[PDB]
């Protein structure tokens, strides 16, 4: 007894810390930069949609104005 405390504690004392650091690094890398880039891309597409909407609205208002 009291000799399995080492073999159940020291293991996770380093392996768990290193593995969780690895998980945090990979998750941040996968998540943050890709999300910001994708949001910028969607913003550019949204601006293009806004331009198309403005053009169509203006041309239809020009024709229909009677």
């Amino acid at each position: 007894d009291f000799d399995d405390i080492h073999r159940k504690r020291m293991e996770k004392d380093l392996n768990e810390l290193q593995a969780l650091i690895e998980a945090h690094f990979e998750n941040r890398k996968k998540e943050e930069e890709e999300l910001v880039s994708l949001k910028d891309r969607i913003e550019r597409r949204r601006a293009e949609r806004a331009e198309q909407q403005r053009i169509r609205n203006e041309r239809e208002k020009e024709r229909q104005n009677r």
Partner: protein, 55 residues
């Protein structure tokens, strides 16, 4: 978050174990040194008794 708390808990388990071992060792030193000094006093009294016997 998640892993950070567990790592802190590990760092705290090390804290408790190290501190407890230090305190126990300090108590051991106190007891052992008291033993040694009492033995030395007994030796001194034996020297004095030997001196009286020599007289």
């Amino acid at each position: 978050m998640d892993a950070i708390k567990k790592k802190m808990q590990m760092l705290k388990l090390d804290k408790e174990n190290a501190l407890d071992r230090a305190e126990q060792a300090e108590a051991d030193k106190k007891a052992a040194e008291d033993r040694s000094k009492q033995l030395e006093d007994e030796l001194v009294s034996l020297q004095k008794k030997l001196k009286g016997t020599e007289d």
